[PDB]
Amino acid sequence: RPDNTAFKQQRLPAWQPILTAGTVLPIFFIIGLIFIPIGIGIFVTSNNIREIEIDYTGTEPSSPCNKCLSPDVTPCFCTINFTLEKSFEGNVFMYYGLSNFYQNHRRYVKSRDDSQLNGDSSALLNPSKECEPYRRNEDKPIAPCGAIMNSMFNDTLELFLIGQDSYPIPIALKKKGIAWWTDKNVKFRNPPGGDNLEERFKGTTKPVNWLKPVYMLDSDPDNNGFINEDFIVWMRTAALPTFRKLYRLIERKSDLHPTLPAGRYWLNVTYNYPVHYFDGRKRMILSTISWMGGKNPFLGIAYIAVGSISFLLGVVLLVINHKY
Amino acid sequence: TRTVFVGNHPVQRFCDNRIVSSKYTLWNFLPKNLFEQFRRIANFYFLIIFLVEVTVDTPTSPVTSGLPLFFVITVTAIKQGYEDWLRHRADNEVNKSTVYIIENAKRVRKESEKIKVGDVVEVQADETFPCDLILLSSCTTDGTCYVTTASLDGESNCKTHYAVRDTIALCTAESIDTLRAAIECEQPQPDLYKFVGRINIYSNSLEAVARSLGPENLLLKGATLKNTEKIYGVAVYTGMETKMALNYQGKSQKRSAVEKSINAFLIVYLFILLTKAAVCTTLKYVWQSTPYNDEPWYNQKTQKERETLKVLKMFTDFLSFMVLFNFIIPVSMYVTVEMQKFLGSFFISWDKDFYDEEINEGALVNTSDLNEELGQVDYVFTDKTGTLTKLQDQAAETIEALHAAGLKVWVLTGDKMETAKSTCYACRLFQTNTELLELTTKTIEESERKEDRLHELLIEYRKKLEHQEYGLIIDGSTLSLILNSSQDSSSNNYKSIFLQICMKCTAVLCCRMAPLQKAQIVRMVKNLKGSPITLSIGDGANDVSMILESHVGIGIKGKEGRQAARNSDYSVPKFKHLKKLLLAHGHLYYVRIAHLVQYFFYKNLCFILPQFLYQFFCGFSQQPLYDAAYLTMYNICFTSLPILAYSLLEQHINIDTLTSDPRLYMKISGNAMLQLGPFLYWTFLAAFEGTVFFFGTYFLFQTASLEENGKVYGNWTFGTIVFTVLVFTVTLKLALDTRFWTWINHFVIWGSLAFYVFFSFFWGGIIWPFLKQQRMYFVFAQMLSSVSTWLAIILLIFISLFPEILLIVLKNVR
Ligand SMILES: CCCCCCCC/C=C\CCCCCCCC(=O)O[C@H](COC(=O)CCCCCCC/C=C/CCCCCCCC)COP(=O)(O)OCC[N+](C)(C)C
Ligand SMILES: *[C@@H]1O[C@H](CO)[C@@H](O)[C@H](O)[C@H]1NC(C)=O
Ligand SMILES: [Mg+2]
């Protein structure tokens, strides 16, 4: 027939691979030979990383920061002494961790006006209905509407190094550059027009829990409102009940000295964020990084355990096929 | 009785001459199509879900569970409406035929559809009668005509019919006009051999002659006229009352064994869904029992949500979990199934192995709903006259291939017992060393002798056997004694005793069978000890009832007529084309769809299990793990094309090597690939992979940073890693099952992975002003700046595909 083409007659050219057991046995050896060395490389890298986490949520009678678990005068001030046995070599990063904090809760995640945080003129005055309980108060719309922005983490952590004398030398913490380039440079934008940020938020009001409006978060025009690094970092949800958020980074000194020399340090914290209502902890984490990121032995242990199981299975399936 | 006037003038309550081989008219198309579409449990479930989401107030618009349902329903309805429209056109070429009618002293030509009861029709030599005529006159003397009813009862001899003695000398289409008579005939009956009637010819002066009629005058519709230049008959029965059309048993809905396996799978996956939704709700309401677990001061409920009823909140939460996990029951699977059924049915029509030169046409596909059960046939019921017969080109070596494939061939004919047995010997169905167990009317000329030998040749002669040794011969009159008289003896029922012998002999021959008894045999076979898939292949109008009765009915485009090629599912213009139709086409058709339906459930279980495991680490708050842009696009964009192209043009065994070897047919016989064994393997593999994705991503997120610049990830980035691993694993899983790698498979398998990666680049990377969520602006583009995430994804892909590789190494050798 005139329609006796290859497609219509089911005779299209094909590859037809033969996946026999004699051509897959080398695959089990190749995979095991290239997974084990990778697993070792990710395993010593995870061990060379230095990381210290100190807990400061109080809840202990002999805890230095317990004295203001329910303080009478605010703001609270409390200091914690820790020591570094081994100096931190590269550029270290300051994190803060919160457990039992369900940021990945359906009623919490959807509680933002992403169009309003994008600098939209219309969404600024009349925010969305999803951020309902934290949407309007005093007849005025809340500028960072929603639970995510309303419950922003607002502790102040500072680090001091106890020198040869009693007086401490404060180490400099860098604020800018902790959030994603993309979600700070495009996704999070200020309202479009105006001379100063105090004028762009005319009809809006600050969140109830905040002490200062969004336009007074920082004295830096590039870090003032809706583009604040800390606000942007907090407004990215957590994916787990216990999480960590980047707080500051300590750039490596131009000298040969390590960024965090071994010694006794002070972590003196302005205890502003309460977490003991929902039985949540609160810690500060300093850590060095690598090509893979932070300290996690899961990848190193899994790659070795996978490349050694496949290798042994290949040996077994090779000795077995020696009978025939 | 009815009154018929010969010239259609006095000397209404009857229908019009028309053939209806189609199912739906314009009035009952929707009500009848809805019943067939809602026989599917997924459609019923998603109709119930849509109905509940409208009557009550929900946080879930009904549009999420109503648009897919409406799309599926009108996708599988356009196909049925178009397929039945071709059957409407098939009846047009026979209804709007050409017939000549002696209206008034003139040979006006009407259509075969415009014949009324009581008009003198004229039929020439070799012409089939348009309706049930009564022979009034023949041009020659003696008023005798010869009729061959080879399509009505399978007899090859010429039968002689007699005209009416009063009107034998009326010819030339002129004296017919001057004929006044009234026919008082019996209301139509399907016996095909008896007829009672009367003619009351009235002359100008006086004629009270009442010549009693009989079957020797009636000319049936569908029987050709031979060795007579022309005749002059008067229509009495005019379609849907013709004796040929009264033996049609009535159309029903045919559904293959794969469509019934989908309903059984949907029952298991409905229990998984209701278990997930119940386990999540029960654990949610014990988690929320802690005062600080709900309203923890950082997300607080509104007043409306606080004052709502707790008992209504339980129901709403259960239904919300059901909506969250509803993808476990795929409705996009029906759109793929019907599309691949419609596009795969063209391989039968396009085949050049089904082309007959002497009649100049190939195979026909009336219905594409039963492509997959051509590879599941267990019994073959073949006519003889016209179908098996000299013999046909390969009528004997086609039966050998059917026997090697494990099929059972029964011959159901309406011809003489001796002729039929000689034909069965000729086609090597009854070999020389085959002892015949004749149950015909020759030895059963009584009612009680039937018991004396039905039990004699089964208990004492058949249990005392080889399988091939014996062969049964049954008659149509004796089968009536077996069936009708079995309503009294229930201790030793004649039907069961007869059926025991039928299943123990190599071949069964049924002779002198009425068209409604060949359907009764298929009905008896269809009901015994399970679900034997039955096939019936015929060429005449007496095979139509058994074609509409079997699971799949094949028709032969023979010289007798096209009555069995219009009421069938497929029509090959030869008996030998059944070998390639079943062995080569049915095998691939079943193998493709059985793999597709298993893969569709595996695909969705791997998609939903990580989202169910997320609830234990969320606040049990039915928060989706993946983005709304991923949840909807997973089934229609990322994983829709690779399985469509596989199940359309994938050959696990080359099309030229399973036609040569017929013993590969029994490998898949008995719904082998849709059984509990394979179902459990696919479900357990899907559960293992779904657990691996989530718990390999969860242990990776204990780092506080996955990249070198020390930046943290959110919940959406947690969801995109799981989704990437899931998509790559379920796509590379099908690449391992592919044995026919065409350039189209290379384009839809590697083009689906290359499109998902770029869609991440594009969806994340362009700001749309009209959107109001903007929650995935650069999630993947910041995900790809970390080496440790790439290494984890590749590791989780190989771990999940490790059982498949192990089974390929173990089972697929020796
Ligand atoms: C879509 C755009 C982004 C959405 C924005 C985000 C918000 C959306 C929110 C609301 C819901 C939207 C739903 C609308 C759509 C539902 C339609 C529906 O139902 O028919 C869908 C389309 O049929 C199909 O299988 C597709 C047709 C058959 C297969 C052929 C594939 C055709 C497309 C291929 C393009 C791929 C090309 C590129 C890759 C390959 C390389 C070349 C199937 O249903 P489903 O499985 O998707 O539904 C399940 C969800 N259940 C249960 C709630 C209803
Ligand atoms: C560190 O915190 C303490 C807490 O009272 C407070 O005196 C001040 O903010 C800091 N002190 C020094 C010495 O850095
Ligand atoms: Mg026939």
Residue numbers in the entry:
A (entry chain C): 27 to 350
B (entry chain A): 19 to 29, 38 to 415, 651 to 726, 743 to 1091
Please share text taken word for word from the publication where this structure appeared.
Most mammalian P4-ATPases, except ATP9A and ATP9B, require an accessory subunit, CDC50A, for their proper localization and functional expression in the plasma membrane. A previously reported disease-associated Q84E mutation in ATP11A confers the ability to flip PC, implicating the involvement of this conserved residue in substrate specificity.
We first determined the structure of the outward-open E2P state, at 2.88 Å resolution, stabilized by the phosphate analog BeF3- and exogenously added DOPC, to confirm whether the mutation itself perturbs the conformation or binding site structure. This density resolved the acyl chains but was more diffuse for the hydrophilic head group, suggesting that the phospholipid is not tightly bound. In the E2P state of the WT, PS forms only a few hydrogen bonds with the binding site, including an interaction between Asn352 in the unwound region of TM4 and the terminal carboxyl group of PS. This indicates that the WT binding pocket in the E2P state loosely accommodates the PS head group, and this is also the case for the bound PC in the Q79E structure. In addition, since the terminal methyl group of PC’s quaternary amine cannot form a hydrogen bond with Asn352 of Q79E mutant, PC binding is likely much weaker than PS in the WT, as seen by its weak density. Although the side chain of Q79E was slightly offset relative to that of Q79 in WT, as the Q79E residue is located quite distant (10.3 Å) from the PC head group, making it unlikely to be directly involved in substrate recognition in the E2P state. Because the observed structure is in the outward-open state, the binding pocket is not constricted enough to restrict PC’s binding pose, possibly explaining the reason for the weak EM density for bound PC in the Q79E mutant.
